[PDB]
C-alpha cells in the first residue's frame, strides 16, 4: 500500500506548489537555478518545465501540461491542480478505508459523464455570428498586455483570423465535422516587416516572397493554373512553380508557352497549396509589391480552411509580441465556435458541479457513492484556492458560496479584485465551456492512470 501513497504524493507535491499560479491575482514565484539567474514569472507553463522531478508520476503530470497548453492558451495549472486534489481527497479512501483502486477508477468514469452534463446546463447560449460580440469575448485575452493600445485593432484582426480558418458545415448525412479547426498548421503566420497593424489583412492562400524570374512577363492572368512539382528544371498550364531553383535555360523555353516560372518554394508550403488548388478557379494572381518586397497571390473565391496570415507592423519587435498574443487570443475564440455556450468564471462553474454531484450521488445508493463526495470536495478547492489568494476567509466564504447555489443561480463566482461573493454575469466575467470540458475530462483521465500503477519497475 506504500506504493499507492507514493503515487499520490508525486502529483500532490507538484500541485501544491502551483496553487498560487491560478487567477489574475496569482502570486509570483521564484526558482533557484545553479546559475546566478532566476525565474521571476508566475506562468505555470514556464515553471513546470524548469522543475526537476524524481518519481515518474510527476513526469506524467508534466506531459499533461504540455498537451493542455497546445489545446488552449490558459487553464494549464487548473488541470494539474484539479487532478492532484482528486488523489488527495481519495487518499484516505484508498488507504485507510481499504477500497479497491478500480472501484475508485470506475467511479471516476461515471462521475466524468455527470460532471459534463452539469456544465452544459449551467452554460448560457451565445451568438457566434455577431461580430461585435466576438470582439468582447476576445478582449479578455487582449487587455492587460502590450496590445492594449492596439486592442481596438487587435479585436478586428483576431476576429477575421478565426473566421478565416473556420467553416460552418453540419448535417446528419456525413456527420458532424466540428468545423475542423487547427491553429498550428493552418493558422500559421508569416511576419513581414514594415506596414501597418490596421492595414494588416488575413489572406487565404500561400504567400511567397519570390518574384518573376523574367524581366518582361504578364503580371496578371485571367484564369491562372498552379502546378506543383518536385524535380527542378535544369496540359498547357498557365503557371509553372518549382520547389527547387530553375536555370535560366528553362526560362525562355516556358516563355513561349504562356506560363510563368516560379522557383525556390518551401516544401511545407506545398501541402497548403493543394488546399487552394488541388490550378483552375484561382481568384487573383496580382504580384503587386507590398512593403518594398515583391509578393504573389495564390488566393481564390473559396474557403479551403488553409491560409497564411499576413502580419504587418511598425517593426519586427512589434510583430513578435503580436505573434504569441494573437495565438492566445484565437484560442479563446476557437472555444466559442466549438459550441454556442459560455460558462461563468471565478469558480462558479467549479462550484456548480460540486453542488449537483452531492445531490445526485445520494440517489444512486452504491459503492461508488463514497468517492463522489471526494470529487465534490475537489471541485470546491479551485474557487477556494482563489479565496486564499484573495485574502478572504476560506472557511466562511466557501460555506456561504455553497449555500447560495441551493437558492440562487449557479453563475455566482468569486471576484479577484474585490474578494467577496458576487455574480459573474452582471459584472462581466465569462469563460468558454471548452476549457471546463477539457479541465474535468483530462484531470480525471490522468488521475485514473496514476492509480493503475501499484509497482515501480526498475530496468532497461
Amino acid at each position: 500500500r506504500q506504493a499507492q501513497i507514493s503515487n499520490i504524493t508525486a502529483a500532490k507535491a507538484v500541485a501544491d506548489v502551483i496553487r498560487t499560479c491560478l487567477g489574475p491575482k496569482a502570486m509570483l514565484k521564484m526558482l533557484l537555478d545553479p546559475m546566478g539567474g532566476l525565474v521571476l514569472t508566475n506562468d505555470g507553463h514556464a515553471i513546470l518545465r524548469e522543475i526537476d522531478v524524481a518519481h515518474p508520476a510527476a513526469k506524467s503530470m508534466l506531459e499533461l501540461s504540455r498537451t493542455q497548453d497546445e489545446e488552449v492558451g490558459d487553464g494549464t495549472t487548473t488541470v494539474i491542480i484539479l487532478a492532484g486534489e482528486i488523489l488527495a481527497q481519495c487518499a484516505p479512501y484508498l488507504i485507510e478505508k481499504n477500497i479497491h483502486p478500480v472501484i475508485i477508477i470506475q467511479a471516476l468514469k461515471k462521475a466524468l459523464t455527470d460532471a459534463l452534463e452539469v456544465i452544459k446546463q449551467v452554460s448560457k447560449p451565445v451568438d457566434v455570428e455577431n461580430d461585435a460580440a466576438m470582439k468582447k469575448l476576445i478582449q479578455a485575452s487582449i487587455g492587460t498586455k502590450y496590445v492594449i493600445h492596439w486592442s481596438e485593432k487587435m479585436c478586428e484582426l483576431a476576429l477575421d483570423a478565426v473566421k478565416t480558418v473556420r467553416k460552418d458545415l453540419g448535417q446528419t448525412v456525413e456527420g458532424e465535422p466540428n468545423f475542423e479547426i487547427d491553429i498550428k498548421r493552418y493558422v500559421r503566420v508569416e511576419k513581414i516587416p514594415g506596414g501597418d497593424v490596421l492595414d494588416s489583412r488575413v489572406l487565404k492562400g500561400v504567400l511567397l516572397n519570390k518574384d518573376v524570374v523574367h524581366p518582361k512577363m504578364s503580371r496578371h492572368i485571367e484564369n491562372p493554373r498552379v502546378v506543383l512539382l518536385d524535380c527542378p528544371l535544369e496540359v498547357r498550364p498557365t503557371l509553372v512553380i518549382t520547389e527547387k531553383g530553375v536555370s535560366d535555360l528553362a526560362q525562355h523555353y516556358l516563355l513561349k508557352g504562356g506560363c510563368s516560372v516560379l522557383r525556390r518554394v518551401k516544401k511545407s508550403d506545398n501541402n497548403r497549396i493543394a488546399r487552394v488548388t488541388g490550378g483552375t478557379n484561382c481568384g487573383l494572381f496580382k504580384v503587386e509589391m507590398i512593403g518594398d518586397e515583391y509578393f504573389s497571390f495564390l488566393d481564390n473565391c473559396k474557403e479551403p480552411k488553409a491560409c497564411t496570415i499576413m502580419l504587418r507592423g511598425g517593426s519586427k519587435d512589434i510583430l513578435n509580441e503580436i505573434d504569441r498574443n494573437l495565438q492566445d487570443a484565437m484560442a479563446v475564440a476557437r472555444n466559442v465556435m466549438l459550441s454556442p455556450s459560455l460558462s461563468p468564471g471565478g469558480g462558479a462553474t467549479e462550484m456548480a458541479v460540486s453542488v449537483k454531484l452531492a445531490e445526485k450521488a445520494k440517489q444512486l445508493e452504491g459503492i461508488q457513492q463514497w468517492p463522489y463526495q471526494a470529487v465534490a470536495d475537489a471541485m470546491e478547492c479551485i474557487p477556494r484556492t482563489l479565496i486564499q489568494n484573495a485574502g478572504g476567509d476560506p472557511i466562511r466564504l466557501l460555506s456561504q458560496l455553497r449555500a447560495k447555489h441551493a437558492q440562487g443561480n449557479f453563475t455566482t463566482g468569486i471576484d479577484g479584485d474585490k474578494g467577496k461573493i458576487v455574480d459573474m454575469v452582471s459584472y462581466g466575467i465569462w469563460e468558454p465551456e471548452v476549457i471546463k470540458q477539457q479541465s474535468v475530462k483530462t484531470a480525471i483521465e490522468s488521475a485514473c492512470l496514476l492509480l493503475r500503477v501499484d509497482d515501480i519497475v526498475s530496468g532497461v
Binding site: 491575482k25 502570486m27 521564484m30 533557484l32 546566478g36 532566476l38 521571476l40 489568494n389 484573495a390 485574502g391
Partner: protein
C-alpha cells in the same frame, strides 16, 4: 495531514542584511566601502550599483535588488543606494503586519494605490525651473548634491566649476539635449588630487620630446 508551509522569514531577513550594509554609506555623511578581489584589485566606491557588480550574493532576494538598479543607472544615474533603502525598510514595516495575519495581496495592492496617489502629490510638490542660461549660479548648488556625497567635501569646491562648465560649454541654448560622450576622462599618477583642473580641448598621450621644441605657442594652426 498537510497544511501549507507558512513560507517567508527567509527573503525579508536576507533583505534586512543588505539594508544594514547600505544604510551606513547613504548620503554625504555616509562611508566609503572597500572591496578586495584577492588578485590585487582595490576599489573604493560609495555607489550602490558599482559595489553590487563586484559582490556575488547567493540569496536570490538580493539578486533582483541589484537588477532593479540596472534601469536606474541607465536613466536616472543617481540614487541607486536610496532605492535599496526603500526596498529593505518597506519589508521590515510589512513584516509586523504579516505576522498579524494580513494577506500580502492587500499589502501589495496597498502599495500600488499609494504609489498612484504619490504621483499626484509629486507633480504639486515639484518646482518648474526656467531653461535660461543664467541659472548657472543656481546650478552650482545643484551640482554640490552629487559631489558632496562621494567625497570628503574638500575637493567639492575644486570640482564644482569643472563639472558645471563641462556641460554648458558644449551645449548651445535650445531644447535639444546634452551628450556626455564628448567629455573624455584621462588620468595620470604621481600627483595630488587637488591639482585637478578643467580642460577645454582634448588631451593627447604621446608628446614631443626634444629640448628645442617651443613650450608655449600662441595662435597656431592645426594640420
Amino acid at each position: 495531514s498537510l497544511r501549507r508551509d507558512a513560507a517567508l522569514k527567509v527573503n525579508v531577513t536576507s533583505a534586512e542584511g543588505l539594508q544594514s550594509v547600505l544604510e551606513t554609506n547613504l548620503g554625504p555623511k555616509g562611508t566609503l566601502k572597500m572591496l578586495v578581489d584577492g588578485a590585487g584589485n582595490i576599489k573604493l566606491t560609495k555607489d550602490g550599483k558599482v559595489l553590487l557588480t563586484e559582490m556575488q550574493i547567493q540569496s536570490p532576494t538580493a539578486v533582483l535588488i541589484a537588477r532593479a538598479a540596472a534601469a536606474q543607472d541607465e536613466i536616472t544615474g543617481d540614487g541607486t543606494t536610496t532605492v535599496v533603502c526603500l526596498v529593505g525598510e518597506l519589508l521590515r514595516q510589512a513584516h509586523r503586519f504579516i505576522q498579524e495575519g494580513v494577506h500580502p495581496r492587500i499589502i501589495t495592492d496597498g502599495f500600488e494605490i499609494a504609489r498612484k496617489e504619490s504621483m499626484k502629490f509629486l507633480d504639486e510638490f515639484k518646482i518648474s525651473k526656467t531653461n535660461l542660461s543664467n541659472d548657472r549660479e543656481f546650478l552650482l548648488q545643484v551640482a554640490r548634491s552629487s559631489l558632496l556625497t562621494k567625497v570628503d567635501a574638500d575637493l567639492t569646491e575644486v570640482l564644482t566649476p569643472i563639472v558645471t562648465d563641462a556641460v554648458l560649454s558644449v551645449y548651445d541654448a535650445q531644447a535639444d539635449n546634452l551628450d556626455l560622450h564628448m567629455v573624455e576622462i584621462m588620468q595620470m599618477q604621481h600627483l595630488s588630487p587637488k591639482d585637478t583642473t578643467f580642460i577645454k580641448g582634448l588631451v593627447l598621450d604621446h608628446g614631443g620630446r626634444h629640448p628645442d621644441m617651443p613650450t608655449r605657442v600662441k595662435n597656431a594652426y592645426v594640420l
